[PDB]
Symmetry: C2
Subunit: 319 residues, 2 copies
């Protein structure tokens, strides 16, 4: 029921960067195998513990690395996300789907726990926009979204048909202090804290009053563990559970920011392509199934986050 | 609006066999190219006009044949279906998904019309059981179903994002005098007419009051043409349309047969495997977006079909 030996694919992405460190501290530097397509100069991960080059689209090599460390858990983060997927759609289909089916076939063969993250991106324009149910209409118009729905279906098939322990969460916008603003769809809520301690002024690429689910990275990382290790028998859903901690418009963060940096200002430009995608997406999701089935918890509201972000961005040296 | 030159993948399928023979008569033996992985001598398709051997998963050969006959319409029937798909789910994923992305990328390059059939098997337990809407939940437990939902999403992405003319329908169970029965889930509704004319006992593998959507082959084929040629501007949905002619249960065909062969009798010894898949499917769909958007219609009720089937199977001579 608990993880001993863990393989993370996509370990140098936003989530992997901070997850591999957490699980190292909690499960042992020698029991967490971080893996990626390519090294990144001075990522913390790469210079501290066990690390293995892995292209998840090679079943053979993926299987080699599972067997080499006798893993009981695979946290399959490898994928192309929103921005990159739209530009490179066939590359996103190949990585996101051949990577996944490879991992599932490995987990089928080895009796692994298999965690795949999904996204708000797995919801369409007609998906209900307010307390979006767990089970509902999933017709997204992005290639990333299509891969996440295709994957939810496939991960549930490996459980229903072969008994593989597959599970996952639909992450909203994540906010972290370790990973720098990457001009992605939801990254407005990270860059705002940078431009607050750096100038006293932020230029939003996202229209005022536009509401979105968000979660602070520590909340999200705990989701992954709480769910991987949850008792099997109370799981009605598996791939994947809505989770959320907050919804907010750019103007609501500002008000949380200014409660600690009173001179703070919010201008509004409007990238119409990212607004488009934010408008695709629900305003708020219903975590109930998550709460009922494995006791999804969380610690940071918009205030608690805002305080901790401005501490952790000063310690790192921005002001 | 009109099909000039037509490539048909999977042309020796159930749909394939009778569709090529129909589009030959209608559009000319020299404007329809039948294609399949493997030949059969038995097939009427193979001794009547143009036939290319084609493995749809080879993008290069698929492109070669498309270009060779300057084709404006591709009808992508190539796929593994519900039963075979459960035996070898990986072959099914490769053929149904790499086949289809290949055809979509071709259609993107050659500005073609891309018609791809879905089915009822694209619907779950969660899926409303009576008058299932066009836009509902799609969480199938079959590999075939996972392929048909991944498929619809992909086909719509190719239209929303690159303006490819992608369109399809969700086929109920289909009945035919041409393509022999046995194997598939809904085939009881063909085999029965064979045993009705041999002796006058059918033993069914489906339990006494299980409603299922069904359709007589000619309604189905006419559906494909009507939808391919329909005008684009009143299409709100594309991939793929709910369509149906009739819901019914062993009970009700039996009694329809007795109007013509009164002596008839139905024993019952159910297959768990298949019965499940039926119970996992809607009892009746809602055709009402088809009708509004491209004037869908059928013309065989349960009785009109039972007449036609019984003539046609005794012409081929059976008793």
């Amino acid at each position: 029921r608990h993880m001993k030996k863990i393989l993370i694919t996509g370990a140098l992405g936003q989530i992997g960067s901070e997850l591999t460190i957490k699980l190292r501290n909690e499960y042992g530097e020698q029991n967490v195998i971080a893996s990626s397509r390519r090294v990144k100069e001075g990522n913390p991960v790469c210079e501290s513990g066990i690390f293995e080059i892995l292209d998840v689209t090679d079943k053979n090599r993926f299987f080699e690395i599972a067997k080499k460390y006798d893993v009981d858990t695979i946290i399959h983060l490898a994928s192309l996300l929103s921005a990159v997927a739209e530009s490179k759609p066939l590359e996103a289909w190949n990585l996101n789907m051949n990577g996944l089916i490879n991992g599932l076939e490995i987990a089928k063969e080895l009796d692994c726990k298999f965690f795949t993250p999904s996204s708000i991106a797995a919801f369409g324009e007609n998906s209900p926009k307010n307390m979006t149910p767990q089970d509902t209409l999933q017709r997204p118009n992005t290639m990333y979204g299509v891969t996440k729905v295709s994957g939810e279906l496939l991960c549930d098939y490996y459980h229903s048909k072969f008994g593989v322990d597959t599970r996952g969460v639909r992450f909203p916008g994540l906010i972290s202090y370790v990973t720098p603003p990457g001009g992605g769809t939801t990254d407005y809520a990270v860059d705002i804290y940078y431009e607050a301690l750096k100038n006293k002024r932020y230029k939003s690429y996202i229209a005022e009053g536009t509401k979105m689910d968000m979660m602070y990275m520590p909340d999200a990382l705990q989701s992954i563990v709480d769910l991987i290790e949850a008792p099997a028998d109370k799981l009605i859903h598996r791939n994947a559970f809505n989770i959320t901690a907050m919804s907010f418009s750019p103007e609501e963060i500002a008000d949380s920011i200014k409660k600690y940096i009173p001179d703070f200002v919010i201008e509004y430009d409007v990238d119409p392509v990212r607004q488009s995608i934010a408008d695709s997406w629900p305003n708020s999701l219903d975590s109930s199934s998550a709460v009922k089935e494995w006791n999804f918890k969380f610690s940071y509201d918009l205030d608690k986050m805002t305080k901790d972000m401005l501490e952790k961005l000063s310690e790192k040296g921005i002001g």
